[PDB]
Design an enzyme around this catalytic site. Structure first.
Site, PDB file in Angstrom:
ATOM      1  N   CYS A  61      -0.720   4.224   1.730  1.00  0.00           N
ATOM      2  CA  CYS A  61      -0.665   4.059   3.183  1.00  0.00           C
ATOM      3  C   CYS A  61       0.721   4.395   3.725  1.00  0.00           C
ATOM      4  O   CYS A  61       0.869   5.254   4.601  1.00  0.00           O
ATOM      5  CB  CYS A  61      -1.029   2.630   3.584  1.00  0.00           C
ATOM      6  SG  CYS A  61      -2.566   2.013   2.958  1.00  0.00           S
ATOM      7  N   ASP A  62       1.750   3.710   3.221  1.00  0.00           N
ATOM      8  CA  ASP A  62       3.062   3.701   3.854  1.00  0.00           C
ATOM      9  C   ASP A  62       4.040   4.716   3.279  1.00  0.00           C
ATOM     10  O   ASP A  62       5.116   4.900   3.861  1.00  0.00           O
ATOM     11  CB  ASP A  62       3.667   2.302   3.752  1.00  0.00           C
ATOM     12  CG  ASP A  62       2.818   1.264   4.430  1.00  0.00           C
ATOM     13  OD1 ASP A  62       2.122   1.623   5.408  1.00  0.00           O
ATOM     14  OD2 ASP A  62       2.839   0.098   3.991  1.00  0.00           O
TER      15      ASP A  62
ATOM     16  N   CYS B  89       0.857  -1.192   0.000  1.00  0.00           N
ATOM     17  CA  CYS B  89       0.000   0.000   0.000  1.00  0.00           C
ATOM     18  C   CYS B  89       0.891   1.239   0.000  1.00  0.00           C
ATOM     19  O   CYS B  89       1.267   1.749   1.061  1.00  0.00           O
ATOM     20  CB  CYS B  89      -0.962   0.013   1.184  1.00  0.00           C
ATOM     21  SG  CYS B  89      -2.155   1.375   1.068  1.00  0.00           S
TER      22      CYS B  89
HETATM   23  C1  LIG Z   1      -3.728  -1.407   3.934  1.00  0.00           C
HETATM   24  C2  LIG Z   1      -5.084  -0.970   3.430  1.00  0.00           C
HETATM   25  C3  LIG Z   1      -5.557   0.299   3.740  1.00  0.00           C
HETATM   26  C4  LIG Z   1      -6.798   0.742   3.281  1.00  0.00           C
HETATM   27  N1  LIG Z   1      -7.223   2.031   3.619  1.00  0.00           N
HETATM   28  C5  LIG Z   1      -8.403   2.434   3.153  1.00  0.00           C
HETATM   29  C6  LIG Z   1      -8.869   3.764   3.506  1.00  0.00           C
HETATM   30  O1  LIG Z   1      -8.272   4.591   4.189  1.00  0.00           O
HETATM   31  N2  LIG Z   1     -10.111   4.076   3.000  1.00  0.00           N
HETATM   32  C7  LIG Z   1     -10.916   3.251   2.233  1.00  0.00           C
HETATM   33  O2  LIG Z   1     -11.998   3.690   1.836  1.00  0.00           O
HETATM   34  N3  LIG Z   1     -10.478   2.000   1.908  1.00  0.00           N
HETATM   35  C8  LIG Z   1      -9.275   1.621   2.349  1.00  0.00           C
HETATM   36  N4  LIG Z   1      -8.823   0.357   2.019  1.00  0.00           N
HETATM   37  C9  LIG Z   1      -9.695  -0.506   1.197  1.00  0.00           C
HETATM   38  C10 LIG Z   1     -10.864  -1.058   1.998  1.00  0.00           C
HETATM   39  O3  LIG Z   1     -10.336  -1.644   3.186  1.00  0.00           O
HETATM   40  C11 LIG Z   1     -11.665  -2.052   1.150  1.00  0.00           C
HETATM   41  O4  LIG Z   1     -12.100  -1.436  -0.059  1.00  0.00           O
HETATM   42  C12 LIG Z   1     -12.911  -2.560   1.880  1.00  0.00           C
HETATM   43  O5  LIG Z   1     -12.592  -2.908   3.229  1.00  0.00           O
HETATM   44  C13 LIG Z   1     -13.549  -3.754   1.211  1.00  0.00           C
HETATM   45  O6  LIG Z   1     -14.614  -4.233   2.057  1.00  0.00           O
HETATM   46  P1  LIG Z   1     -15.246  -5.655   1.854  1.00  0.00           P
HETATM   47  O7  LIG Z   1     -16.615  -5.546   2.528  1.00  0.00           O
HETATM   48  O8  LIG Z   1     -15.181  -6.020   0.425  1.00  0.00           O
HETATM   49  O9  LIG Z   1     -14.383  -6.689   2.728  1.00  0.00           O
HETATM   50  P2  LIG Z   1     -12.866  -6.789   3.195  1.00  0.00           P
HETATM   51  O10 LIG Z   1     -12.410  -5.431   3.728  1.00  0.00           O
HETATM   52  O11 LIG Z   1     -12.033  -7.330   2.103  1.00  0.00           O
HETATM   53  O12 LIG Z   1     -13.034  -7.821   4.328  1.00  0.00           O
HETATM   54  C14 LIG Z   1     -13.635  -9.111   4.080  1.00  0.00           C
HETATM   55  C15 LIG Z   1     -13.639  -9.908   5.362  1.00  0.00           C
HETATM   56  O13 LIG Z   1     -14.349 -11.147   5.151  1.00  0.00           O
HETATM   57  C16 LIG Z   1     -13.648 -12.201   5.753  1.00  0.00           C
HETATM   58  N5  LIG Z   1     -13.863 -13.422   4.983  1.00  0.00           N
HETATM   59  C17 LIG Z   1     -13.332 -13.706   3.754  1.00  0.00           C
HETATM   60  N6  LIG Z   1     -13.634 -14.901   3.306  1.00  0.00           N
HETATM   61  C18 LIG Z   1     -14.393 -15.453   4.325  1.00  0.00           C
HETATM   62  C19 LIG Z   1     -15.017 -16.709   4.472  1.00  0.00           C
HETATM   63  N7  LIG Z   1     -14.977 -17.671   3.543  1.00  0.00           N
HETATM   64  N8  LIG Z   1     -15.714 -16.938   5.613  1.00  0.00           N
HETATM   65  C20 LIG Z   1     -15.766 -15.975   6.538  1.00  0.00           C
HETATM   66  N9  LIG Z   1     -15.211 -14.760   6.510  1.00  0.00           N
HETATM   67  C21 LIG Z   1     -14.536 -14.557   5.370  1.00  0.00           C
HETATM   68  C22 LIG Z   1     -12.180 -11.787   5.754  1.00  0.00           C
HETATM   69  O14 LIG Z   1     -11.541 -12.347   6.897  1.00  0.00           O
HETATM   70  C23 LIG Z   1     -12.261 -10.271   5.927  1.00  0.00           C
HETATM   71  O15 LIG Z   1     -12.121  -9.987   7.319  1.00  0.00           O
HETATM   72  C24 LIG Z   1      -7.580  -0.117   2.494  1.00  0.00           C
HETATM   73  C25 LIG Z   1      -7.111  -1.387   2.179  1.00  0.00           C
HETATM   74  C26 LIG Z   1      -5.873  -1.825   2.642  1.00  0.00           C
HETATM   75  C27 LIG Z   1      -5.396  -3.205   2.287  1.00  0.00           C
END
Ligand SMILES: Cc1cc2nc3c(=O)[nH]c(=O)nc-3n(C[C@H](O)[C@H](O)[C@H](O)COP(=O)(O)OP(=O)(O)OC[C@H]3O[C@@H](n4cnc5c(N)ncnc54)[C@H](O)[C@@H]3O)c2cc1C
Ligand SMILES: Cc1cc2nc3c(=O)[nH]c(=O)nc-3n(C[C@H](O)[C@H](O)[C@H](O)COP(=O)(O)OP(=O)(O)OC[C@H]3O[C@@H](n4cnc5c(N)ncnc54)[C@H](O)[C@@H]3O)c2cc1C
Ligand SMILES: [Ca+2]
Ligand SMILES: [Ca+2]
Ligand SMILES: [Ca+2]
Lengths: 356, 338
Positions: free
Chosen positions: B160-161, B157
């Site tokens: 981020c970093d 990222c």
């Molecule tokens: C380092 C970093 C920093 C970021 N900073 C920002 C920011 O400042 N602002 C922003 O808007 N976005 C940021 N993002 C992006 C943001 O985090 C994502 O766009 C968003 O969180 C996606 O949400 P999601 O609901 O798709 O699930 P995710 O955030 O991808 O989380 C999915 C969750 O589901 C769980 N899961 C997966 N498969 C299974 C399974 N089979 N059974 C049960 N549980 C499961 C996983 O453990 C995980 O905890 C950042 C991303 C990263 C990597």
């Protein structure tokens, strides 16, 4: 629909030129501003001077507690939430202008716009891209008496006002004939003593089996071919509706302490009515899953382009998409500008885990 | 794609049966949970047992500063933000289970699924609808030494970093061959003394004008046909990369104090490989503007179905949409049940 590409032959305003102008100050517009301000694009956001009847901050400033916006496990009032949005927009350098945008000209780029009171031809300001986030309002019929009992018995959100003590174990009316009405009517049977559904027609918009569940309900009376013609009361609360059957002619007073409009919403499209494609209900059409209007360089976010979900959290997400698509266009055209030195070209930096 | 409509004659589970099960615990799955719990649908949400290498709460649990989620004008840490999401889901009655769903069978409804470690044939549970919100993993390339210097010089990222002191006015490298690489390298020019872009192909998959600007930035060197083969340092922090040219085969040393991947957004779709329509990159295909997948009763939210925006706020919004559409389907099927 198709996307018209405006010629980029318009004059630049000497009064004010911006790369991106946001029109509207609900969750849609402020989320766009947060993203564009953090991208150092210096967004200008017009929040309105009671634009379309709403204070800056939008529809949420007309509700109380909000409980389905995530990140607030104990709830937050609509007022506090939109103060938070505005502070976040401002913090990162949004230029927030408490003015109503009175007119836009989408013919050529950069787009011309005018604020209310500065509407002479030579007072135009220009914008390379515009994000329309002007919102919507609930449709009312403005019955004789409605001015008196609006928010004193007459409502336009059954799930918002249903549990209010004034309706509890009281007869209630719903005006509507769609899935909205049959859904809101079923919900209101949790609180009212009885729910009358006034349907202008003899049949259904909602799935013919679902409103069969309406009729079967002992707390629900569907009045087909029926309209309300007057709202009466006692000086504090609605107490009856004058109703009429339009096929039989039967008319009389229907005592109710509550009237709930479920006839849809009116999108705030006055700025662009003859300039972007609209749907049959007047909503701004967008490439599906996208903020892009029928005019290249004009994006839309929030309820003005969403009649299906109509939440703050979807409006917010939608404003982010508008910000990201406007910035990408701005980045594209700045990259193609051979006059600008590469070090001066804006490049987005919005991702975290890249996708190359 | 067409939307396949499963028969509704499947065996109902005696272990557990639910109207709606949400798989995943990022902003997407919890927003859906909040809406469905409030709709009194009693959603079940599997938040994973370190699924995809992330703690419950998702990708945000690895960032200390979320600044662009509206409602938090003073910022918030990612783990605090997702703790608040979790508290809201549970306040309105979500049943939150700390298990990874290991297997799903979408052939008939109610859909069958199994949690990790309880995958015997008879251990299935059933859900009338499923919301896939499984998100995305952080895909680390094969790179000797990456184990030693991951998060001590190597990072996935840039935005981020980029600003942490270890990279400040030091040579930095970006691995990637498209718009994301161009975006991260230009951002890093703000902090690095210089930025190399290691491009695996002969042509940047980015538009010709984007590739044209990258090469002519005074603080950027695009290295075409170049891969990293070794990350090297003083045993504590990264100090150089061995690189190889894929067309000439020549090997060299590149002094860098930071290496940033601009690849490695892998959507978490292994559960539904060959059961829902996926795009070429493994993203779940949705009826556009909707959460509807190629199978009736299965909806998707968040990064697992969004290769384009990839934000927490857009993931939350799409989680709401998934919930409203699952509630609607559940509603029409209860009404039609006479
Ligand atoms: C380092 C970093 C920093 C970021 N900073 C920002 C920011 O400042 N602002 C922003 O808007 N976005 C940021 N993002 C992006 C943001 O985090 C994502 O766009 C968003 O969180 C996606 O949400 P999601 O609901 O798709 O699930 P995710 O955030 O991808 O989380 C999915 C969750 O589901 C769980 N899961 C997966 N498969 C299974 C399974 N089979 N059974 C049960 N549980 C499961 C996983 O453990 C995980 O905890 C950042 C991303 C990263 C990597
Ligand atoms: C009573 C009520 C309760 C609600 N409760 C909830 C709830 O609990 N949870 C939830 O998720 N959603 C709720 N909603 C819905 C939510 O408020 C909307 O979905 C959301 O606010 C729409 O955001 P928006 O960005 O489209 O703009 P809006 O909120 O519609 O705001 C638009 C703003 O733009 C301004 N504007 C318009 N035209 C101009 C112009 N020409 N120049 C300048 N400014 C202009 C207007 O003055 C207004 O302030 C509720 C709505 C209502 C009416
Ligand atoms: Ca004025
Ligand atoms: Ca287990
Ligand atoms: Ca050699």
């Amino acid at each position: 629909f198709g996307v018209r590409e405006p010629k980029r032959t318009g004059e630049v305003s000497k009064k004010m030129h911006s790369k991106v102008v946001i029109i509207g100050s609900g969750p849609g517009g402020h989320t766009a501003a947060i993203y564009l301000a953090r991208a150092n694009l210096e967004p200008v956001l017009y929040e309105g001077m009671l634009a379309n009847g709403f204070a800056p901050g939008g529809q949420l400033t007309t509700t109380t507690d909000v409980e389905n916006f995530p990140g607030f496990p104990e709830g937050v009032t609509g007022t506090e939430m939109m103060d938070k949005f505005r502070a976040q927009s401002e913090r990162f350098g949004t230029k927030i202008i408490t003015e109503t945008v009175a007119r836009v000209d989408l013919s050529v780029r950069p787009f011309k716009y005018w604020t209310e009171g500065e509407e002479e031809e030579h007072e135009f300001m220009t914008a390379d891209t515009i994000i329309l986030a002007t919102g919507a309002s609930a449709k009312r019929l403005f019955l004789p008496g409605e001015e008196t009992y609006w928010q004193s018995g007459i409502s336009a959100c059954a799930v918002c006002d249903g549990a209010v003590p004034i309706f509890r174990q009281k007869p209630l009316a719903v005006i509507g004939g769609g899935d909205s009405a049959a859904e809101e009517a079923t919900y209101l049977t949790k609180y009212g003593s009885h729910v009358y559904v006034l349907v202008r027609r003899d049949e259904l918009r909602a799935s013919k089996i679902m409103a069969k569940r309406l009729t079967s309900h002992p707390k629900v009376t569907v009045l087909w071919n029926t309209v309300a013609t007057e709202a009466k009361g006692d000086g504090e609360v609605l107490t009856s509706l004058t109703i009429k059957n339009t096929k039989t002619g039967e008319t009389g007073d229907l005592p109710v302490n509550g009237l709930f409009y479920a006839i849809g919403h009116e999108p705030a499209t006055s700025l662009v009515k003859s300039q972007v494609e609209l749907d049959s209900d007047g909503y701004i059409k967008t490439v599906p899953g996208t903020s892009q209007t029928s005019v290249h360089g004009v994006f839309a976010a929030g309820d003005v382009q969403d009649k299906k979900y109509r939440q703050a959290i979807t409006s917010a997400g939608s404003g982010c998409i508008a910000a990201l698509e406007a910035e990408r266009l701005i980045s594209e055209e700045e990259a193609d500008d051979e006059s600008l030195q590469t070090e001066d070209v804006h490049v987005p930096a919005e991702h975290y885990l890249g996708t190359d």
